[PDB]
Amino acid sequence: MVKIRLMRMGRVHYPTYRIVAVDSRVKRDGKYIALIGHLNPALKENKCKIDEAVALEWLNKGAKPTDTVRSLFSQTGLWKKFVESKK
Amino acid sequence: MKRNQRKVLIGIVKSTKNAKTATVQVESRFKHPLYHKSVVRHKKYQAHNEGEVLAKDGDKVQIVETRPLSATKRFRIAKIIERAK
Amino acid sequence: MVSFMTRLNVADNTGAKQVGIIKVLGSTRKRYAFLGDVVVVSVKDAIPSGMVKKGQVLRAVIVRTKKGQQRKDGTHLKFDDNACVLIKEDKSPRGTRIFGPVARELRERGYNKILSLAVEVV
Amino acid sequence: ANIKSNEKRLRQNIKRNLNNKGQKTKLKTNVKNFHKEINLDNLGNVYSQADRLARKGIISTNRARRLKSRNVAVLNKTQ
RNA sequence: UGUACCAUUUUGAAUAAGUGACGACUAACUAUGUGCCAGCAGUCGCGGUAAUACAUAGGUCGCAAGCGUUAUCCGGAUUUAUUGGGCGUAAAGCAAGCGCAGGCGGAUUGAAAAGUCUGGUGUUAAAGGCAGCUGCUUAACAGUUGUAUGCAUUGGAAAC
RNA sequence: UCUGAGAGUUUGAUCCUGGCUCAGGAUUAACGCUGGCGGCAUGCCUAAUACAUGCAAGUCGAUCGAAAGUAGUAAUACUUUAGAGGCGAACGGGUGAGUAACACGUAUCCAAUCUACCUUAUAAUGGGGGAUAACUAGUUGAAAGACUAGCUAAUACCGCAUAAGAACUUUGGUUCGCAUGAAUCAAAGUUGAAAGGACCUGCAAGGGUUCGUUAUUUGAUGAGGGUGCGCCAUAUCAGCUAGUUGGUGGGGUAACGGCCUACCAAGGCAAUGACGUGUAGCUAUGCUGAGAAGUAGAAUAGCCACAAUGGGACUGAGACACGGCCCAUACUCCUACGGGAGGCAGCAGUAGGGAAUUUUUCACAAUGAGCGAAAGCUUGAUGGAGCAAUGCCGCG
RNA sequence: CAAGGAACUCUGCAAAUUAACCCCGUAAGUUAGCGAGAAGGGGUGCUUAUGUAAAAGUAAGCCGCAGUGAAGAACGAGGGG
Ligand SMILES: [Mg+2]
Ligand SMILES: [Mg+2]
Ligand SMILES: [Mg+2]
Ligand SMILES: [Mg+2]
Ligand SMILES: [Mg+2]
Ligand SMILES: [Mg+2]
Ligand SMILES: [Mg+2]
Ligand SMILES: [Mg+2]
Ligand SMILES: [Mg+2]
Ligand SMILES: [Mg+2]
Ligand SMILES: [Mg+2]
Ligand SMILES: [Mg+2]
Ligand SMILES: [Mg+2]
Ligand SMILES: [Mg+2]
Ligand SMILES: [Mg+2]
Ligand SMILES: [Mg+2]
Ligand SMILES: [Mg+2]
Ligand SMILES: [Mg+2]
Ligand SMILES: [Mg+2]
Ligand SMILES: [Mg+2]
Ligand SMILES: [Mg+2]
Ligand SMILES: [Mg+2]
Ligand SMILES: [Mg+2]
Ligand SMILES: [Mg+2]
Ligand SMILES: [Mg+2]
Ligand SMILES: [Mg+2]
Ligand SMILES: [Mg+2]
Ligand SMILES: [Mg+2]
Ligand SMILES: [Mg+2]
Ligand SMILES: [Mg+2]
Ligand SMILES: [Mg+2]
Ligand SMILES: [Mg+2]
Ligand SMILES: [Mg+2]
Ligand SMILES: [Mg+2]
Ligand SMILES: [Mg+2]
Ligand SMILES: [Mg+2]
Ligand SMILES: [Mg+2]
Ligand SMILES: [Mg+2]
Ligand SMILES: [Mg+2]
Ligand SMILES: [Mg+2]
Ligand SMILES: [Mg+2]
Ligand SMILES: [Mg+2]
Ligand SMILES: [Mg+2]
């Protein structure tokens, strides 16, 4: 029940996220298993320096993304590679 | 096949006065945290002489751990070099 | 019928395990104390975490008797141990709870607080 | 100081306990009857009750397996 | 949240300075009062009628929206000294001996490889640590990449 | 490529041994004086003391009967939810009382284990039956409720037919292992499944997507056990241990195991510190030091333990369950005197202790969780805003 | 002899409790011999079976308010002269 999801590690009035593979029952901002890549709500462009390597391994393993997590994958195009690799 | 390998320990028998037992003693040379000198220790593990191994007192015996057969017994005897006493 | 120098139990939370009667209060040569009677007592067996200390002279009212007494209808109420609870001048219990059952003779002689703090009246 | 979910859960588990206890008692009486007057016939009934309970979860699957293996050992020894 | 911020928007220096110390360690001194009295003090110590050490005042110095005092931890302290101390006269050689276990230990050869050294792999969670960079008016701060330490296993070295 | 500052003080004066004090940092800090603002962060160290009051885990009508409301002549259409059922309530949040040992850190072996939902792959999802919530009526009550008799529904429950594969054995082969021992067959015997919902098409018959279900398969996550090493003070604590040590057969546990049982024995640990006493959550880390290391385990993060005190168990993939259940103890409160109610070490706040540490706040808007197809819904986690020169930084 | 239990009296005088056997456990002090039957507790009947030379004991069952069912069997602790 690994779940690629976010983790807030910014400061007051300035969030900062990191895509990460973690279990569902682990608290947010806690212990995790593997690092994918970071995010910034105000990076203008390239807001999601993705990895494109282990992420495909964990999704193939069966990781369940989230709504905002999925969103990031689509603008780069990671959803395409995952679904076509399934096929 | 590929089978994870168990840990081994080489020791000497100190006493044997029960049914199927052998109180072996294993030594080690752990360093000292501050004065940095080797110190000889002594700890007495127990094992079972199920058979074919006997290993009476004074017999230099090698020891491999095993699933706990009982409380305080988690080791088994094996090959015996320098059979004496 | 509790009499002079009678050891009896306390049915409340106050730290007093054994209490000894000193005087059967009420008149001259009052021989016995029946249910509802007030007596002067001395704490003899107490506990460290108790409001009373060993040796204090205090006033108590009896609630149970081994001998028992007979009511007007003919019913004879009889307990298995003599018990008393420590009371204050106002007739208000010193403890915050009462253990075990109590008689109905208390109701006649006031003692409404004792009845309301009991487990069940008999 | 109380939650309807917790209250409802307590009310449901009383009924579940009744039903599961009935099922467990049948297995207990059946294995005792079997080993009483030993007979290869009974053995079958033992399998049916143990496997069914194991699927429903009422009994841990491992306990059914150990009971099954051990009861079959008695028959082979006696036959 | 009509919040940060912005503008040639009105008024206008207007709405804003305290605390410790001044004999030495320790940058900074005079007068008045008191007269072993009243008081100060982290240490040495000041006060007995000419007090730069007390009280007040003026001056001056150290700090600053903070300044002093108190409490606790570390350093300085080589003042429990493995690194890194001593035992004649300053603290410290038992009154002396026989001595098991422990520690140490002559020379040469062979083997093994437990110490010892080295290569490969795994791991030592993330934050923090140090270096670089970015973003907040720069900073504090946040993010970013880099950055060891030990353990286990395996392959070699053979001087002690 | 690391990298270290001293001074005062015994004497009439000097040298040395030697103790005391100071110059530097630092804190969950407090007190006195004073006091303008902004950006970050911190904020009961004590009484794991007791708590007023209000909030802190629910969700699905696309599982099911019924009821209610609004429109409609009617058939019916829409909305709402007390109850049955599924799922989640074991996550998340708080505190550090207990605990000196496999608790924890590290490395490991689980030929001695579990894992619901999730991943891959593979067979089925046919047909019956008996019940009870809601409702009605009666008794008992102010009400909470409780008891009694009838009425219904299903993805609730219980049989039956059926096994691609499963589980337990039997027959001999295979490949063997680290001692118990695993690994693979071919044949056979024995045993064992469930449930439908939404929508589309089709005159119909039938067909179809999707959710969901049973039986398996792959992994992964999470949980559990054992072991080596490391991990406080004290000898002005020297013996301790009788399920303690071992074997046998049996029972139990997810599993090995004196975990339990009956028998047979007398061992095990201990001066290389047992046992006892006192103390303490451990670790990554914080402060300090040139370094070796000393010191505290703020905040936060990993692991353990706890939920007024002490025990037991149900349900479940997972609890012996903070705001579930049962019992006892202590404490408080309500009553119409028969009976009951309660657990702020969840967010605030109150009383008390203290030298001393804050809103009885707003919103799920972002992140996160639980249920749902969505609409959504619930989130004192979380995100903000108050408060305080509490610390760093900046400007007047 | 119901309730109380030394309130009686110069004084627990007298009376009352315990009492046999078997199985647990037993302190301060000491001249190391004792204290000590210390203190404090438990079981006892009948039947069946197993145990033995006989037992004692062990397991199951039965009855009564009570089972050395009656007789005979030590009350104890602490301080002082
Ligand atoms: Mg053995
Ligand atoms: Mg179960
Ligand atoms: Mg002064
Ligand atoms: Mg002056
Ligand atoms: Mg020092
Ligand atoms: Mg030092
Ligand atoms: Mg010296
Ligand atoms: Mg000398
Ligand atoms: Mg000499
Ligand atoms: Mg001498
Ligand atoms: Mg000599
Ligand atoms: Mg020697
Ligand atoms: Mg790290
Ligand atoms: Mg940072
Ligand atoms: Mg001098
Ligand atoms: Mg200083
Ligand atoms: Mg509803
Ligand atoms: Mg709960
Ligand atoms: Mg919890
Ligand atoms: Mg929190
Ligand atoms: Mg706390
Ligand atoms: Mg589930
Ligand atoms: Mg049906
Ligand atoms: Mg069938
Ligand atoms: Mg079903
Ligand atoms: Mg055994
Ligand atoms: Mg503690
Ligand atoms: Mg130093
Ligand atoms: Mg902390
Ligand atoms: Mg804390
Ligand atoms: Mg609560
Ligand atoms: Mg609170
Ligand atoms: Mg509490
Ligand atoms: Mg939300
Ligand atoms: Mg500040
Ligand atoms: Mg500043
Ligand atoms: Mg009498
Ligand atoms: Mg009497
Ligand atoms: Mg008298
Ligand atoms: Mg008299
Ligand atoms: Mg006499
Ligand atoms: Mg005596
Ligand atoms: Mg005398």
PDB file of N, CA and C in Angstrom, chain A residues 47-80:
ATOM      1  N   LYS A  47       8.174  23.354 -12.387  1.00  0.00           N
ATOM      2  CA  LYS A  47       7.780  23.271 -10.983  1.00  0.00           C
ATOM      3  C   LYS A  47       7.987  21.899 -10.354  1.00  0.00           C
ATOM      4  N   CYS A  48       8.178  20.843 -11.160  1.00  0.00           N
ATOM      5  CA  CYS A  48       8.267  19.475 -10.643  1.00  0.00           C
ATOM      6  C   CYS A  48       9.447  18.754 -11.298  1.00  0.00           C
ATOM      7  N   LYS A  49      10.639  18.957 -10.736  1.00  0.00           N
ATOM      8  CA  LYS A  49      11.809  18.214 -11.185  1.00  0.00           C
ATOM      9  C   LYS A  49      11.587  16.738 -10.888  1.00  0.00           C
ATOM     10  N   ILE A  50      11.002  16.017 -11.843  1.00  0.00           N
ATOM     11  CA  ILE A  50      10.655  14.614 -11.652  1.00  0.00           C
ATOM     12  C   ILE A  50      11.920  13.778 -11.817  1.00  0.00           C
ATOM     13  N   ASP A  51      11.851  12.498 -11.449  1.00  0.00           N
ATOM     14  CA  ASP A  51      12.960  11.561 -11.588  1.00  0.00           C
ATOM     15  C   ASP A  51      12.882  10.743 -12.871  1.00  0.00           C
ATOM     16  N   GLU A  52      11.709  10.173 -13.163  1.00  0.00           N
ATOM     17  CA  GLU A  52      11.418   9.366 -14.348  1.00  0.00           C
ATOM     18  C   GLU A  52      12.078   7.992 -14.313  1.00  0.00           C
ATOM     19  N   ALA A  53      12.619   7.568 -13.168  1.00  0.00           N
ATOM     20  CA  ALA A  53      13.315   6.287 -13.108  1.00  0.00           C
ATOM     21  C   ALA A  53      12.674   5.352 -12.089  1.00  0.00           C
ATOM     22  N   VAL A  54      12.901   5.590 -10.793  1.00  0.00           N
ATOM     23  CA  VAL A  54      12.321   4.705  -9.785  1.00  0.00           C
ATOM     24  C   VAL A  54      10.808   4.865  -9.746  1.00  0.00           C
ATOM     25  N   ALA A  55      10.306   6.074 -10.029  1.00  0.00           N
ATOM     26  CA  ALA A  55       8.864   6.298 -10.090  1.00  0.00           C
ATOM     27  C   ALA A  55       8.168   5.273 -10.979  1.00  0.00           C
ATOM     28  N   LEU A  56       8.733   4.987 -12.156  1.00  0.00           N
ATOM     29  CA  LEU A  56       8.140   3.952 -13.000  1.00  0.00           C
ATOM     30  C   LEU A  56       8.232   2.580 -12.359  1.00  0.00           C
ATOM     31  N   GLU A  57       9.298   2.317 -11.605  1.00  0.00           N
ATOM     32  CA  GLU A  57       9.382   1.045 -10.905  1.00  0.00           C
ATOM     33  C   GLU A  57       8.287   0.934  -9.851  1.00  0.00           C
ATOM     34  N   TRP A  58       8.076   2.001  -9.072  1.00  0.00           N
ATOM     35  CA  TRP A  58       7.094   1.930  -7.997  1.00  0.00           C
ATOM     36  C   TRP A  58       5.665   1.908  -8.535  1.00  0.00           C
ATOM     37  N   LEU A  59       5.388   2.659  -9.610  1.00  0.00           N
ATOM     38  CA  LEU A  59       4.072   2.579 -10.243  1.00  0.00           C
ATOM     39  C   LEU A  59       3.818   1.205 -10.845  1.00  0.00           C
ATOM     40  N   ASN A  60       4.842   0.610 -11.463  1.00  0.00           N
ATOM     41  CA  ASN A  60       4.708  -0.757 -11.954  1.00  0.00           C
ATOM     42  C   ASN A  60       4.501  -1.716 -10.795  1.00  0.00           C
ATOM     43  N   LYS A  61       5.186  -1.463  -9.680  1.00  0.00           N
ATOM     44  CA  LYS A  61       4.967  -2.259  -8.482  1.00  0.00           C
ATOM     45  C   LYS A  61       3.540  -2.119  -7.963  1.00  0.00           C
ATOM     46  N   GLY A  62       2.887  -0.995  -8.231  1.00  0.00           N
ATOM     47  CA  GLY A  62       1.505  -0.860  -7.819  1.00  0.00           C
ATOM     48  C   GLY A  62       1.225   0.327  -6.927  1.00  0.00           C
ATOM     49  N   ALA A  63       2.073   1.348  -6.998  1.00  0.00           N
ATOM     50  CA  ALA A  63       1.877   2.524  -6.167  1.00  0.00           C
ATOM     51  C   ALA A  63       0.646   3.291  -6.628  1.00  0.00           C
ATOM     52  N   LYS A  64      -0.154   3.742  -5.663  1.00  0.00           N
ATOM     53  CA  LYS A  64      -1.359   4.492  -5.970  1.00  0.00           C
ATOM     54  C   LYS A  64      -1.087   5.977  -5.822  1.00  0.00           C
ATOM     55  N   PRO A  65      -1.190   6.765  -6.881  1.00  0.00           N
ATOM     56  CA  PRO A  65      -0.937   8.203  -6.781  1.00  0.00           C
ATOM     57  C   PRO A  65      -2.126   8.903  -6.131  1.00  0.00           C
ATOM     58  N   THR A  66      -2.025  10.222  -6.035  1.00  0.00           N
ATOM     59  CA  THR A  66      -3.095  11.054  -5.504  1.00  0.00           C
ATOM     60  C   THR A  66      -3.563  11.985  -6.621  1.00  0.00           C
ATOM     61  N   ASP A  67      -4.559  12.823  -6.326  1.00  0.00           N
ATOM     62  CA  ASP A  67      -5.070  13.729  -7.348  1.00  0.00           C
ATOM     63  C   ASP A  67      -4.005  14.732  -7.778  1.00  0.00           C
ATOM     64  N   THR A  68      -3.414  15.439  -6.814  1.00  0.00           N
ATOM     65  CA  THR A  68      -2.356  16.390  -7.135  1.00  0.00           C
ATOM     66  C   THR A  68      -1.095  15.688  -7.613  1.00  0.00           C
ATOM     67  N   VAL A  69      -0.822  14.495  -7.084  1.00  0.00           N
ATOM     68  CA  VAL A  69       0.344  13.728  -7.510  1.00  0.00           C
ATOM     69  C   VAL A  69       0.202  13.304  -8.969  1.00  0.00           C
ATOM     70  N   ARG A  70      -0.962  12.755  -9.331  1.00  0.00           N
ATOM     71  CA  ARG A  70      -1.229  12.394 -10.723  1.00  0.00           C
ATOM     72  C   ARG A  70      -1.063  13.598 -11.640  1.00  0.00           C
ATOM     73  N   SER A  71      -1.672  14.726 -11.260  1.00  0.00           N
ATOM     74  CA  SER A  71      -1.615  15.959 -12.043  1.00  0.00           C
ATOM     75  C   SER A  71      -0.201  16.260 -12.525  1.00  0.00           C
ATOM     76  N   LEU A  72       0.769  16.233 -11.609  1.00  0.00           N
ATOM     77  CA  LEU A  72       2.156  16.524 -11.959  1.00  0.00           C
ATOM     78  C   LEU A  72       2.664  15.585 -13.049  1.00  0.00           C
ATOM     79  N   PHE A  73       2.350  14.295 -12.937  1.00  0.00           N
ATOM     80  CA  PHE A  73       2.821  13.315 -13.912  1.00  0.00           C
ATOM     81  C   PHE A  73       2.336  13.629 -15.325  1.00  0.00           C
ATOM     82  N   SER A  74       1.133  14.192 -15.457  1.00  0.00           N
ATOM     83  CA  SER A  74       0.549  14.373 -16.783  1.00  0.00           C
ATOM     84  C   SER A  74       1.190  15.502 -17.590  1.00  0.00           C
ATOM     85  N   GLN A  75       1.481  16.664 -16.991  1.00  0.00           N
ATOM     86  CA  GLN A  75       2.061  17.735 -17.804  1.00  0.00           C
ATOM     87  C   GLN A  75       3.410  17.321 -18.381  1.00  0.00           C
ATOM     88  N   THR A  76       4.234  16.627 -17.595  1.00  0.00           N
ATOM     89  CA  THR A  76       5.475  16.104 -18.157  1.00  0.00           C
ATOM     90  C   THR A  76       5.192  14.974 -19.141  1.00  0.00           C
ATOM     91  N   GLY A  77       4.272  14.075 -18.798  1.00  0.00           N
ATOM     92  CA  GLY A  77       3.912  12.988 -19.687  1.00  0.00           C
ATOM     93  C   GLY A  77       4.160  11.622 -19.086  1.00  0.00           C
ATOM     94  N   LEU A  78       4.298  11.553 -17.761  1.00  0.00           N
ATOM     95  CA  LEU A  78       4.629  10.277 -17.136  1.00  0.00           C
ATOM     96  C   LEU A  78       3.456   9.302 -17.190  1.00  0.00           C
ATOM     97  N   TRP A  79       2.222   9.815 -17.167  1.00  0.00           N
ATOM     98  CA  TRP A  79       1.049   8.958 -17.302  1.00  0.00           C
ATOM     99  C   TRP A  79       1.087   8.161 -18.599  1.00  0.00           C
ATOM    100  N   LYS A  80       1.528   8.793 -19.688  1.00  0.00           N
ATOM    101  CA  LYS A  80       1.623   8.104 -20.972  1.00  0.00           C
ATOM    102  C   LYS A  80       2.556   6.899 -20.889  1.00  0.00           C
TER     103      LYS A  80
END
